[PDB]
Amino acid sequence: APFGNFPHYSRFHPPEQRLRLLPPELLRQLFPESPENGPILGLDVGCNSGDLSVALYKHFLSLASREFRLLCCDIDPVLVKRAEKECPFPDALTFITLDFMNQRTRKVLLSSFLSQFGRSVFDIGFCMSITMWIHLNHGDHGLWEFLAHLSSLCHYLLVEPQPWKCYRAAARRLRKLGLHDFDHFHSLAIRGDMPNQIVQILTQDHGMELICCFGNTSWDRSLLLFRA
Numbered sequence: 333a334p335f336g337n338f339p340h341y342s343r344f345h346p347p348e349q350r351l352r353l354l355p356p357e358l359l360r361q362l363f364p365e366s367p368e369n370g371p372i373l374g375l376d377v378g379c380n381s382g383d384l385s386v387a388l389y390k391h392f393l394s395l396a397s398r399e400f401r402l403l404c405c406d407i408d409p410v411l412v413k414r415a416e417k418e419c420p421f422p423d424a425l426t427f428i429t430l431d432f433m434n435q436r437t438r439k440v441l442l443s444s445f446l447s448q449f450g451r452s453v454f455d456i457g458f459c460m461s462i463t464m465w466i467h468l469n470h471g472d473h474g475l476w477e478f479l480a481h482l483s484s485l486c487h488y489l490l491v492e493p494q495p496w497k498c499y500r501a502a503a504r505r506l507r508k509l510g511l512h513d514f515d516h517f518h519s520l521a522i523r524g525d526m527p528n529q530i531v532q533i534l535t536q537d538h539g540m541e542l543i544c545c546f547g548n549t550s551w552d553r554s555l556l557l558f559r560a
């Protein structure tokens with residue numbers, strides 16, 4: 333699993349103590365309630381086995397005027413269709429297999445999904461614990477391009493950057509497991525304060541402003557909310 337496609341990542345830190353400081357009223361606190369805008373469209377990048385996506389859907393409190401549709405994508409197809417067969421809400425969550433660092437696949441599938449509601453772009457994006465894997469697999473330039481695509485693809489963006497602590501463990505686990513091919517740990521110049529580095533990249537470069545954060549940047553894991 334070089335892209336970090338660990339089966340059932342949910343055994344690793346539980347959904348509940350990654351959203352305990354996340355307000356359930358977030359969907360109420362971010363979007364108007366006029367139904368003319370249509371459903372609230374979320375893009376969950378990196379839905380390992382649907383656990384955290386289902387938990388995010390069950391966690392947010394609805395508006396009772398619009399409905400929350402969530403397109404979740406992942407690079408491992410077996411994991412995606414497991415998430416499909418394990419998923420409580422069929423008519424609310426749509427699972428697809430996508431390598432987000434592929435222009436053609438991403439453009440085609442994301443326009444196929446958003447054509448169903450008009451929706452030139454998404455409403456809210458979810459980038460939970462995928463930053464480090466995009467980084468390790470495509471260098472600083474791939475992290476930059478990933479954040480750029482998500483900034484120009486979403487109105488709001490809830491990123492969970494993995495700290496530099498996890499980088500060492502992941503790089504060791506990949507180097508020893510005959511997979512140092514999917515690892516640029518040496519050539520990474522963006523380092524140390526991954527939350528603040530993501531903040532600076534999404535702020536100076538991609539026209540987004542940090543409007544919320546739940547957790548400390550020096551904590552276990554911090555959640556960071558940007559808006560275009």
Ligand SMILES: Nc1ncnc2c1ncn2[C@@H]1O[C@H](CSCC[C@H](N)C(=O)O)[C@@H](O)[C@H]1O
Nearest residue numbers: 335336337378380384406407431432460461
């Ligand atoms: N280029 C890429 N495009 C899409 N998904 C990717 C990707 N690289 C990695 N992923 C997916 O991103 C996930 C990161 S693991 C995090 C799982 C989930 N976000 C959670 O926090 O519970 C992995 O399951 C992997 O399958």
